[model samples]
Target: GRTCPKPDDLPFSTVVPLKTFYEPGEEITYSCKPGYVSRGGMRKFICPLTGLWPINTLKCTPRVCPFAGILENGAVRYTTFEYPNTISFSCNTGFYLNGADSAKCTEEGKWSPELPVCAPIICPPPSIPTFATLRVYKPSAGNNSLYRDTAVFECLPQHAMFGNDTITCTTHGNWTKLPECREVKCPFPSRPDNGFVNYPAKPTLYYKDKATFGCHDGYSLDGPEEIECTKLGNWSAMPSCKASCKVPVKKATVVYQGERVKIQEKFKNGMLHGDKVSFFCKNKEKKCSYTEDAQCIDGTIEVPKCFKEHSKTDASDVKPC
Candidate 1:
């Protein structure tokens, strides 16, 4: 019996040596060494007729990481060809840490199933003053997400508020100094005639707040009775009062004696008309005169009278007729 060559050094032999004679339907296997991989077909060479091995050879090739399989964001940087390698991870600017900080490549040339991730840093919500509103333009994402997203704040009318309405996350994994949201107050109260305000004496109002108005006695509300605070922290309309005019009475008269009368006098275009009224003095007595069937004669009085005749009876003293 002769010695057999090592399985790796065997040339043109797909099957390893020293295996007992194989029966029909038996299987054989061969493998390449480290730093190499099988490429040609016939990974197994079987014993055929005449006790000779099949015509096949095992070869080895170098192994390397695939292109486009690299990690991003400084999570990992690989420079070695070693299998089962691992790399550590960390957060970017303004981001907090979360999940596993490291991952390992497996001997099977695949990375671990779990991937490390960084979380976003977030700050607590800021305090908002009374009569003020808060609005967030950007909200927090994951722990590894960036900070510095801003929020907005506004106050009601007449109220004066101060503070930074916005807050941002810093690179230190903490929120930027929180901005205060103060009430934006309005100016002094406006006083209109005959009108009363329900607001304070100074009447400081915040944005969107309402100030009610009402007219005093003998006065009426002319415009919007309630004014609302605008976004500019000013009143939409000023609170005011208006004096109402006295209503006109029909068919009324005011006399020199300080007397008012509502008479049924005939009127034409708001003036006295025909056959209306006349005040006069006749025979030294006050009278109401009216026209009759009489003609005027040369601006003088017309009198009708009968003539009287004297009879001849006066001559009777002398002779008989």
Candidate 2:
């Protein structure tokens, strides 16, 4: 009987133990190693009378795992998905990974430790400060706020907010610091020189407190009629009374209410400030009459001395130009 020598240069390992020699008609088998799979070929070979092991057509290759490259709101870093390879996972900003950061492909052609998920960072509802109310909160209620979400706070009337009105959700899944509301008091409003002011009799006024002002008969009120306490703890603006002006010329033809009239008893008390009156003046050389305007500013109305009065008996013909 012929004998066969040991087989060598095989792509895959043998299933049975190896021996230096084998008699004719003996059989030799092959199997794929770990982390590898059989592609195509016969795993068994027969020893014949030629004293040599026959050629094997068995093909073995590295096993391939399932796809794991896609990650929502995250990233995956890996070269390949073959057996014995590892892949890493990471999340984008404002998100966090929920499972293993990396997973390895096993010999069973499956990933170990499972795939990870990218979860959004969320912050709980913020605490409301006293004397303040939530004005704006984005993303609606009942659900927590996501990263970079905002909320605005408004202080009640007569109270002042000391810090930022807006709060934001941070990256650490927590809300920013809250603002503080404090009571702001202002001093009593002062009355104008010639005007009367009416306000509450409280010892101290608060923010947004109002005061009404009015001037006397001949005076005119300047600025706004009502003043309010501002956030800086002071009145908004004080109203003043502008004094009236008295006409110096008692008897003359002056422009009043856009019409020329002889003064008899019109401006007895005085003319209101910003009132304009024109006086008739005679042009000696042209033999014509012209009017020069004068304005009452504060308490003085400078009547131009160029105005000439016509004699009651002397009949001088004069035309207005």
lDDT per residue as tens, model 2, 1-321:
678887774554455657788888788778777778775644776778888776667677768989999989999999999887999999999898999999999989988989999999888888899999999986643578988999999998789887799999998888888999988888887788878999998888898889999998879876788888887887889878998887666567677888766654567667877678877777778767777888888888887788655432211235775
TM-scores for all predictions: 0.31, 0.53
After TM-score superposition, the amount by which residue 178's alpha carbon in candidate 2 deviates from its true location, in angstroms, is 2.0
* Residue 263's lDDT in candidate 1: 24
Candidate with best lDDT: 2
* Number of backbone collisions per candidate: 29, 0
C-alpha lDDT score of every prediction, in listed order: 0.46, 0.80
Assess candidate 2 and give its lDDT. 0.80
lDDT of 2 at 189: 72
Candidate 2 steric clashes: 0
Tens digit per residue, CA lDDT, model 1, 219-257: 655567777766566777884565433312233222212
